[PDB]
Nucleic acid binder design. Structure first.
Lengths: 388, 551
DNA sequence: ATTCCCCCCCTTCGGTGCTTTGCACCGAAGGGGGGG
């Protein structure tokens, strides 16, 4: 393809580089030197005013470094098979080393500039720009889209039951086959791709809300329960707290045992049936963006909610498993992979972490080829365990 | 001139060259300016232009800290505003602590750096200026720049790129030579003996001269100590150049501002530098000439800083075969010091952290911020994260990071027993306390008149209300909690409808900008066991009928 | 009386978001230090 103009009335990325470890710097220098020889990248000067961050990862624990470029700002200025979710097994293969044979438009190469730093600022950073289609940019799968069909036509027609979805540099192969037959067909697909150059979405279960069950209830216990139902009323209406509020009238000791009246057990039980229900009316708007909140429940437990509008949850989950940042980073990569398979868009996370803490360590444990947008929450969202 | 390819530089789209007219200058300045212009024209730095150049730019002179000498400067502010944007390749400042011990070391400076790199041919017309046409009448002679101008915002980046392009073949043919390049300053280190190193230095000098860059011998350093980037470099140690603090008798705002700046510079190698009590004198006074009398606390800090800055202190270089260790100490009032070293009592570099982030915070939060700052700074200099020695105990950190709602982490670290220790001064019970009084608190303030009442009711036959003036809902809720703490015993359950007060208290602070919160904190430390519970605001709970229709 | 680029700290002020239209957090700009 060719004209890849930006969105009208805005400029290119101007993001800073942020420091890198000397182990990762040595990997980037070796990688970029090899790419320069092949003509994939070329050195530039300071007259280019654009810059995007770059770093290296160790995806799949293959002990081979992989270069990653944060195109999150270039993707925002450039301008899905519903049966994949119901599939049994979704294999995710990498087709990143295939866009290197498609030259990039000459007028667009200036926006893909990046800088490799140096230890102790020994030398000014070495700058490069992309000559071929880069990895991580939203236009790479779009320009190569017309070329993927030619390679996927001899395969998809041979096995119509195979569902194949491409996002960024990742191929999602979904089949209703067995543990072994799926793998054999994957090898056939892999070798088929070479000629021209593990998820289980069926096992994913929503996380409901559960009321605590007790034989005897204290004033403190009822007060905590009343707060839950009042908060849950906004999510699941039809929840009324009157016969439970009537047990919290008058000044009482917080540990006083309150005998549950026979007429109040109905509301406690009735609200439980309402609570044990998938709240309908949640329709994924294709135009709006996905927001994923994450809460730290302690003891190595994390809960998340994916929604487009407040109190209208599209998906609720719970990720279980010393290193808090690594656990959060693993959760982000697992939620994002879920959203790509289910909806096809990476969510906009609201991480429960300090901004300085996240930027320092998130690159260490990252292993995906895509980066979602995230925002850092500061208010303490711990008043009662609403999502326990 | 340098036979290096020019960098294509243009103006911002839709812009034009400057047309500013030159302000009048005294007859003393004009003579030096015309002499300088004549010399530069005869050297080829500038060229005379005819009447076809519409653009112009004012030009003035400075003393150059030499009285007799008069450096010529050009006010390129208009051109810089109209000049395209550049991306700076200078991402930071080299530090001597990151240097490795080298057998042979040289420091060189390129003379007349900017005047050696040619300017792009199409851009020369915008750089046109005119000399103050004499006292007056006859027009001035007008010149245009042929090389990189001084005062133009694109000069540093272009020169840095040209220097890198010049130096890359030499580095490729000499892989065992370390070259730190900062603008026109070169630091060359090698493990060769003095003779071979000196032979290689002359080879580098002839390489630069092949590209027109000259290295005068007056800025060429061959013997230690080396004055490099504000530091004194010795064969096995380094120091900052001498620091002279002011000795005024009646300080002003500007004097204190300059005093604090030098103490921050000295804190990189002098341990224990405090500037908290001195920087507090800069709050509330905005005039730069106002005389601020020194307070008692500020006088104490100044004397301590003077005493610390008296003995000679030096750092050491970096050995890649040893592990970096950073030790942190707490000085009080949100101030921390830290020393990064490799072997004990030989500091690679010191530093301090005194940033006050957030209105309410504790020592454990600030320790994590200091650790993160140290890690980020160490990655820049050495590329690896050091092992930490913190004054917090393992159990305290375990409790904090397990009970905290946020995700926090600290890399490999060990406990060092040096007081004062970092601890949490109080803890909130997870369950209500049996036998202790329950205080249902509530504070309501009228927004219109800024008047309110804060009060509490209790399980027993007690009840209190107190009126507050110039207050809000949040302040009334905090005051209600404070009253509940004030008139209770050692164990207390407090039920409140305010999420703001619960969010403030639950973080376990010990210092706060708000004075009311400090009283609450000092009351919480006195108590033995405290339970804090949240209740819905207006849903008929016991703290809603007899606590809201009241205060 | 008049310039330029880079890093840092400390204080002040405006913007943003949630909620409790006050309060907490953040980023940019002023001052200062240092380098060229």
């Amino acid at each position: 393809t060719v004209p890849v103009k930006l969105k009208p009335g805005m400029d290119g990325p101007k993001v800073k580089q942020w420091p890198l470890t000397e182990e990762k710097i040595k990997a980037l220098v070796e990688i970029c030197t090899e790419m320069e020889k092949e003509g994939k990248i070329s050195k530039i000067g300071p007259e280019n005013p654009y810059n995007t961050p770059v770093f290296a990862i160790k995806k799949k624990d293959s002990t081979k470094w992989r270069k990653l470029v944060d195109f999150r700002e270039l993707n925002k200025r450039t301008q899905h098979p519903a049966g994949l979710k119901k599939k049994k097994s979704v294999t995710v293969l990498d087709v990143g080393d295939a866009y290197f044979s498609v030259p990039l438009d000459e007028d667009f190469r200036k926006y893909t500039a990046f800088t490799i730093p140096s230890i102790n600022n020994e030398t000014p950073g070495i700058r490069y720009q992309y000559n071929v289609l880069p990895q991580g940019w939203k236009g790479s799968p779009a320009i190569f889209q017309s070329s993927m069909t030619k390679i996927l036509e001899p395969f998809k027609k041979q096995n119509p039951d195979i569902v194949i979805y491409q996002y960024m540099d990742d191929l999602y192969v979904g089949s209703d086959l067995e543990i072994g037959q799926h793998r054999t067909k994957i090898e056939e697909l892999r070798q088929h791709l070479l000629r021209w150059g593990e998820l289980h979405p069926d096992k994913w279960t929503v996380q409901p809300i559960v009321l605590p069950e007790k034989d005897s209830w204290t004033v403190n216990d009822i007060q905590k329960l009343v707060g839950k139902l009042n908060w849950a009323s906004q999510i699941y209406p039809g929840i009324k707290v009157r016969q439970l509020c009537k047990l919290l009238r008058g000044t009482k000791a917080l540990t006083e045992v309150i005998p549950l009246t026979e007429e109040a057990e109905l509301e406690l039980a009735e609200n439980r049936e309402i609570l044990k229900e998938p709240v309908h009316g949640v329709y994924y708007d294709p135009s709006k963006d996905l927001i994923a909140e994450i809460q730290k429940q302690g003891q190595g437990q994390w809960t998340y909610q994916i929604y487009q509008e407040p109190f209208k949850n599209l998906k609720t989950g719970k990720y279980a498993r010393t290193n808090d940042v690594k656990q959060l980073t693993e959760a982000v990569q697992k939620i994002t992979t879920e959203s790509i398979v289910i909806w096809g868009k990476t969510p906009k996370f609201k991480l429960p972490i300090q901004k300085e803490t996240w930027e320092t360590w998130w690159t260490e444990y990252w292993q995906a080829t895509w980066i979602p947008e995230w925002e850092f929450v500061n208010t303490p969202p711990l008043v009662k365990l609403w999502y326990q | 001139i340098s036979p290096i390819e020019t960098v294509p530089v243009k103006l911002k789209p839709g812009m034009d060259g400057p047309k500013v007219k030159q302000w009048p200058l005294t007859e003393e300045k004009i003579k030096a300016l015309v002499e300088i212009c004549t010399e530069m024209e005869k050297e080829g730095k500038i060229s005379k232009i005819g009447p076809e150049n519409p653009y112009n730019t004012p030009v003035f002179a400075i003393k150059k800290k030499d009285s007799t000498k008069w450096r010529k400067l050009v006010d390129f502010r208009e051109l810089n505003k109209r000049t395209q944007d550049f991306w700076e390749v200078q991402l930071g400042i080299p530090h001597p602590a990151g240097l490795k011990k080298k057998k042979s070391v040289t420091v060189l400076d390129v003379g007349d750096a900017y005047f050696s790199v040619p300017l792009d041919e199409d851009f020369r017309k915008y750089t046109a200026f005119t000399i103050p046409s004499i006292n007056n009448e006859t027009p001035g002679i007008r010149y245009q720049y042929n090389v990189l101008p001084q005062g133009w915002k694109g000069s540093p980046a272009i020169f840095q790129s040209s220097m890198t392009k010049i130096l890359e073949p030499f580095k490729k043919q000499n892989p065992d030579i370390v070259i730190y390049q900062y603008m026109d300053d070169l630091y060359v280190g090698s493990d060769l003996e003095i003779g071979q190193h000196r032979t290689k230095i002359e080879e580098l000098r002839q390489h630069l001269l092949r590209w027109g860059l000259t290295t005068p011998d007056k800025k060429h350093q061959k013997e230690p100590p080396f004055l490099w980037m504000g530091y004194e470099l010795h064969p096995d140690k380094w120091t900052v150049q001498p620091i002279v603090l002011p000795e005024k008798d009646s300080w002003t705002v500007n004097d204190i501002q300059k005093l604090v700046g030098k103490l921050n510079w000295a804190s990189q190698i002098y341990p224990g530098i405090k500037v908290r009590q001195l920087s507090k004198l800069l709050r509330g006074t905005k005039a730069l000439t106002e005389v601020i009398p020194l307070t008692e606390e500020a006088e104490l800090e100044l004397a301590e800083n003077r005493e610390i800055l008296k003995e000679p202190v030096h750092g050491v270089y970096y050995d890649p075969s040893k592990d970096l260790i950073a030790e942190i100490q707490k000085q009080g009032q949100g101030q921390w010091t830290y020393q990064i070293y490799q072997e004990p009592f030989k500091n690679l570099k010191t530093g301090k952290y005194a940033r006050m982030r957030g209105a309410h915070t504790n020592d454990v939060k600030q320790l994590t911020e200091a650790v993160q700052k140290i890690t980020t700074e160490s990655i820049v200099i050495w590329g690896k994260t050091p092992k930490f020695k913190l004054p917090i105990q393992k159990e305290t950190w375990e409790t904090w990071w397990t009970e905290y709602w946020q995700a926090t982490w600290i890399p490999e670290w060990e406990f060092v027993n040096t007081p004062p220790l970092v601890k949490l001064w109080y803890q909130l019970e997870k369950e209500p306390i049996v036998g202790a009084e329950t205080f249902y608190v509530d504070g309501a303030a009228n927004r219109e008149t800024k008047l309110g009442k804060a009060g509490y009711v209790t399980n027993k036959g007690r009840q209190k209300v107190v009126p507050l003036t110039n207050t809000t809902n949040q302040k009334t809720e905090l005051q209600a909690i404070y009253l509940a703490l004030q008139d209770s015993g050692l164990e207390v359950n407090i039920v409140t409808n305010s999420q703001y007060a619960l969010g403030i208290i639950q973080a376990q602070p010990d210092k706060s900008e708000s004075e009311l919160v400090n009283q609450i904190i000092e009351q919480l430390i006195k108590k033995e066991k405290v339970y804090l519970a949240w209740v819905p605001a207006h849903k008929g709970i016991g703290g809603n009928e007899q606590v809201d229709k009241l205060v």
